[PDB]
Every structure is written in structure tokens, then in C-alpha cells.
Amino acid sequence: ETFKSI
Amino acid sequence: LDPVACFLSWCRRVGLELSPKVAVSRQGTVAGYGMVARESVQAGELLFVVPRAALLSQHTCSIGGLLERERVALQSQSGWVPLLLALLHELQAPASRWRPYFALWPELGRLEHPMFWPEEERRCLLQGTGVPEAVEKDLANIRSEYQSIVLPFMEAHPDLFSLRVRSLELYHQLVALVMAYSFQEPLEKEPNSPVMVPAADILNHLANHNANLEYSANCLRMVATQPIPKGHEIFNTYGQMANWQLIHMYGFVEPYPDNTDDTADIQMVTVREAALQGTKTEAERHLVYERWDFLCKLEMVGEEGAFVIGREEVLTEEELTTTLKVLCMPAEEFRELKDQKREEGSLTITNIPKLKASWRQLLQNSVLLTLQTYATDLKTDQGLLSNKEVYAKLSWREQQALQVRYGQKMILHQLLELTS
Ligand SMILES: C[S@@+](CC[C@H](N)C(=O)[O-])C[C@H]1O[C@@H](n2cnc3c(N)ncnc32)[C@H](O)[C@@H]1O
């Protein structure tokens, strides 16, 4: 799970 | 300069296509590298395309197999260990297919995350903002991962990890980098692990952004969301981000009033506390906890969660509306609910003053308790901000922390005014 999705 | 030119040849080599209208630049950007419009861009216009094989992940890296193979050993709270090992490996690999990409990365020893601040400074400047708590949890996880997982893996595979990357300090820097640079692709529930997206992680962030990323089967597309005039920077959105999250994850803040997405948190147990505070009887106390538990069953509250308050609207909207309803409803009216959906409606600047007196009073008291968790009141921070020459004399970290505290107290005080 890596935060910045866009 | 040359790294930019090298990176752009690399792009061409790996099929990453940039629009002739966009330029990678270090001139006139809000920070470091950014992209600027060479020519005015229209809403909906394609800015660049990144093939999925260009992404740097646990799956595309040269040891993807070993990592997948060992997926159980490499578990953690974050789920980032596989990506961190791919990065650690690729950084020491002589013939890394991503070198020209790494060349644009920031200097690792100059990262601005509060996790790299002296502990007293972090603790003292950011008290009540939620940052010290988050950083402390991060630091603990980072340290345990390195000792029990990452270091023993690297030592088990010395061929794949030179000694120069067996570094706690480096491991901290790469965690920060993943935090600030990585993308996590939305699902559709086992959340996708983050990946590094070349070119896309050059774009800076604003609440008022003019670009965003789209995922497709074979590639990622960065597309304009607003017209972008000639010479204007192109801003991606990292998410709906409050300043406390920006500084924690990205080491920057948006100065007031730029961050239209800023928020303040009211801890859920603080609302409970306010409810208890109003009780005159040990019996009244225990009827409070019955209402609390019912809300825990609805999954509207929880011991470590918080209500999230936006500038114009409550974000954890149904959680809060339902919490107010239940804690405040007549004791008779409750027993029939505890036997036999939740509460609809918005919580906005216009709506809040129209709520029941009992809802507004519980909220008012919760906000007073929340404001008491900061070291100073809003007037103090409002004074440091209003006087530009006083502000200018604050250190960079003090200015950043001030923006976080100020943004949060303003929202809380607005809520105080709305609940009279
Ligand atoms: C995805 S990178 C963007 C590229 C970065 N400017 C660089 O030189 O590599 C995210 C980092 O850029 C910086 N950044 C992004 N948006 C910013 C902003 N609006 N103001 C100040 N710094 C920003 C922060 O340092 C953040 O950690």
C-alpha cells in the first residue's frame, strides 16, 4: 500500500 | 541539465512518450524538478504516457522472482519491504535498467521529512498535529523491518546486495522516498503495493492541481484537468491532502490559505470524553459507554480513529453525524434502537448551526478538548503569521510547523464559532 494513487 | 537530457533519452529507449508541449525544468518551479508548459495546454489533453514495463516495482526489478518467491518472509505493516529491496538492489546494481531514472532523484541526505528532525524539535513544534505520533510509529516500524527482515535478507543474498547498501540510514531515506515519490494503483481487497513511476514523479502537488494520472491496461497516462497557460507549472495531485499529511509524507506544506483540502482531527475518544464530562452520575457514565459500544458495533467509532474536519465540510461525515445522534438521543429512544441504516445528511458551515442544541454542545466541548492538546492557542500562531517580518525570521522548520498548526486551529475555531 503506497499512498499516492492518482 | 545533463541528467535531464540523459533521462529523456532513457525515456525514448523505454517507450515513455512526453508531449512536445511539456518540459522538465528546475526553473520557476515550486521545488526541485517540475514540469512546465512549453505551450498552453487544454483541459483533457494528454501530457505523457508511461508504459507499464517502465515502472520500477518488486515485479519489474531484476530480482522480482526471488522477491515473489519469498513474499511470506518479507511481510510487514506497510507492505513496502519488497519494493524497498527492489530499490536497494537496483541502486547497487552496476547495469541497472533504471540508472538515468535514479539520477533525477533528490539528494537522499537532504530530505525534509520531520522524521529526520531532532526528536525534541518534532515533538515540540508539531504537538497536537498528529505528526509526532505518526512519525514515532514510522520510526519504530522502519527500525524493526531493518533488523528482523531487511538486513538478514541482504546478508542471505550478498551477491544481490553490496555492503554499501546495508545501511540503516539509507533504509530510512528510501522509506521517505517511497512515501514521497511512489504511486499506489487503486484496486478494481488486497491493496496494490506502491511502484515508482518515472516522469510522473517529477510533477509537484497542489490542492488546486491541473493534471492527474489515469491507469489503463498497458500504460499510465498523465492528463491535464485544467487549461494550463504557456510557462505555467504542471501540478499533479498526490491526493486530498491536509498539511499534516503533506509534511509527514512529503516534507512540505501549502501556505495558508492555499490548501483548500486542509483538515483538523477530533479524536473519537475525545468526543466520548466530552460526553462523560457532562455526566453527574456513575450511572450516567455507564449509559455513555453503552452508546459508545453501539457505535463501535455500527463501525462508526473506534478507539484509535478520529473525526476529520474540513474547511467547509466534515469529511468523516456519516461517522460523526451518527455519533452525535446516538450519544444525544433520549435514553428511552436509545433502548428501542439497541433492540430494533445510519444518519444521513451533510455537516457543513451552513448546516452545523442548525443542528440540535445537544449535538452542538457535545461538539463544542469536544473541540475545546482538542484545542487544549496544542501547546498554544490560535492567537499565538495567528500573531506569528500576521507579522511577515516575525514569520520571516522563524527557521524553515518553524515556518512549516506553524502552517500545520495554524491551518488546524483555524478549522477547529471555526467549528467552535459554529457551535456557538
Ligand atoms: C513526487 S516528488 C516531485 C518532484 C520533486 N520536486 C523533485 O525535485 O524530485 C514529491 C516531492 O516534491 C516536493 N514537492 C511537491 N509539491 C510541492 C509543493 N507544492 N511545494 C513544495 N514542495 C513540493 C516535496 O519535496 C515532495 O516530497
Side-chain angles (χ1 to χ4, degrees), chain A residues 3-6, chain B residues 80 183-184 186 215 237:
Chain A
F3 214 61
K4 192 196 304 59
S5 171
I6 356 261
Chain B
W80 295 356
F183 292 70
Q184 189 197 356
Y215 295 81
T237 172

Short mmCIF file of all heavy atoms in Angstrom, two decimals, chain A, chain B residues 80 183-184 186 215 237, unseen atoms left out:
data_model
loop_
_atom_site.label_atom_id
_atom_site.label_comp_id
_atom_site.label_asym_id
_atom_site.label_seq_id
_atom_site.Cartn_x
_atom_site.Cartn_y
_atom_site.Cartn_z
N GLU A 1 0.82 -1.21 0.00
CA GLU A 1 0.00 0.00 0.00
C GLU A 1 0.86 1.27 0.00
O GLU A 1 1.47 1.61 1.01
CB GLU A 1 -0.95 -0.01 1.20
N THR A 2 0.89 2.00 -1.12
CA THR A 2 1.90 3.02 -1.36
C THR A 2 1.53 4.50 -1.47
O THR A 2 2.31 5.30 -2.03
N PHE A 3 0.36 4.86 -0.95
CA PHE A 3 -0.02 6.26 -0.74
C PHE A 3 -0.57 7.01 -1.97
O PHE A 3 -1.79 7.00 -2.23
CB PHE A 3 1.16 7.05 -0.15
CG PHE A 3 0.74 8.12 0.80
CD1 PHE A 3 0.03 7.80 1.96
CD2 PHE A 3 1.05 9.45 0.55
CE1 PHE A 3 -0.36 8.79 2.85
CE2 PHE A 3 0.66 10.44 1.43
CZ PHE A 3 -0.04 10.12 2.58
N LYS A 4 0.33 7.67 -2.70
CA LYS A 4 -0.03 8.48 -3.87
C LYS A 4 -0.59 7.59 -4.99
O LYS A 4 0.13 6.81 -5.61
CB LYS A 4 1.19 9.24 -4.35
CG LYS A 4 0.93 10.33 -5.37
CD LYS A 4 2.24 10.74 -6.04
CE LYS A 4 3.31 11.17 -5.05
NZ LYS A 4 3.67 10.12 -4.06
N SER A 5 -1.88 7.74 -5.26
CA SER A 5 -2.58 6.85 -6.18
C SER A 5 -2.76 7.44 -7.59
O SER A 5 -2.40 6.80 -8.58
CB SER A 5 -3.93 6.44 -5.59
OG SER A 5 -4.73 5.76 -6.54
N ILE A 6 -3.29 8.66 -7.65
CA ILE A 6 -3.67 9.34 -8.90
C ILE A 6 -4.36 8.39 -9.90
O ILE A 6 -5.57 8.14 -9.83
CB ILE A 6 -2.47 10.05 -9.60
CG1 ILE A 6 -1.20 9.98 -8.74
CG2 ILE A 6 -2.86 11.49 -10.01
CD1 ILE A 6 -0.89 11.20 -7.92
N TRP B 80 5.82 -2.65 2.13
CA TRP B 80 6.79 -1.99 1.25
C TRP B 80 8.13 -2.67 1.16
O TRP B 80 8.96 -2.27 0.35
CB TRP B 80 7.05 -0.57 1.72
CG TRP B 80 5.88 0.31 1.62
CD1 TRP B 80 4.66 -0.01 1.11
CD2 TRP B 80 5.80 1.67 2.06
NE1 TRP B 80 3.82 1.06 1.20
CE2 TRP B 80 4.49 2.11 1.78
CE3 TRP B 80 6.70 2.55 2.66
CZ2 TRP B 80 4.05 3.40 2.08
CZ3 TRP B 80 6.27 3.83 2.96
CH2 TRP B 80 4.96 4.25 2.66
N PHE B 183 3.77 5.62 -6.32
CA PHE B 183 2.34 5.60 -6.64
C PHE B 183 1.72 4.27 -6.20
O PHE B 183 2.32 3.21 -6.35
CB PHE B 183 2.11 5.79 -8.14
CG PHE B 183 2.45 7.17 -8.64
CD1 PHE B 183 3.76 7.59 -8.69
CD2 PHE B 183 1.46 8.04 -9.04
CE1 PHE B 183 4.08 8.85 -9.15
CE2 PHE B 183 1.78 9.31 -9.50
CZ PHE B 183 3.09 9.71 -9.55
N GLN B 184 0.51 4.34 -5.65
CA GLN B 184 -0.24 3.12 -5.33
C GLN B 184 -1.47 3.05 -6.22
O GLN B 184 -2.36 3.89 -6.12
CB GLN B 184 -0.66 3.10 -3.86
CG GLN B 184 -1.25 1.77 -3.43
CD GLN B 184 -2.02 1.86 -2.13
OE1 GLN B 184 -2.08 2.91 -1.49
NE2 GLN B 184 -2.63 0.74 -1.73
N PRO B 186 -5.03 2.23 -7.51
CA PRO B 186 -6.29 1.85 -6.85
C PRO B 186 -6.73 0.46 -7.32
O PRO B 186 -6.45 0.08 -8.46
CB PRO B 186 -7.29 2.91 -7.34
CG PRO B 186 -6.46 4.00 -7.96
CD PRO B 186 -5.20 3.35 -8.44
N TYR B 215 -4.88 5.21 -15.10
CA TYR B 215 -4.33 3.90 -15.38
C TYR B 215 -5.12 3.22 -16.50
O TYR B 215 -6.34 3.32 -16.57
CB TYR B 215 -4.34 3.02 -14.12
CG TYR B 215 -3.44 3.50 -12.99
CD1 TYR B 215 -3.85 4.51 -12.12
CD2 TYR B 215 -2.20 2.92 -12.77
CE1 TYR B 215 -3.03 4.94 -11.08
CE2 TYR B 215 -1.38 3.34 -11.72
CZ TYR B 215 -1.80 4.35 -10.88
OH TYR B 215 -0.98 4.76 -9.85
N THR B 237 -1.89 15.88 -8.45
CA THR B 237 -2.44 15.81 -7.10
C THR B 237 -2.01 14.52 -6.44
O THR B 237 -2.21 13.45 -7.00
CB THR B 237 -3.97 15.85 -7.10
OG1 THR B 237 -4.44 15.59 -5.76
CG2 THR B 237 -4.55 14.79 -8.04
#
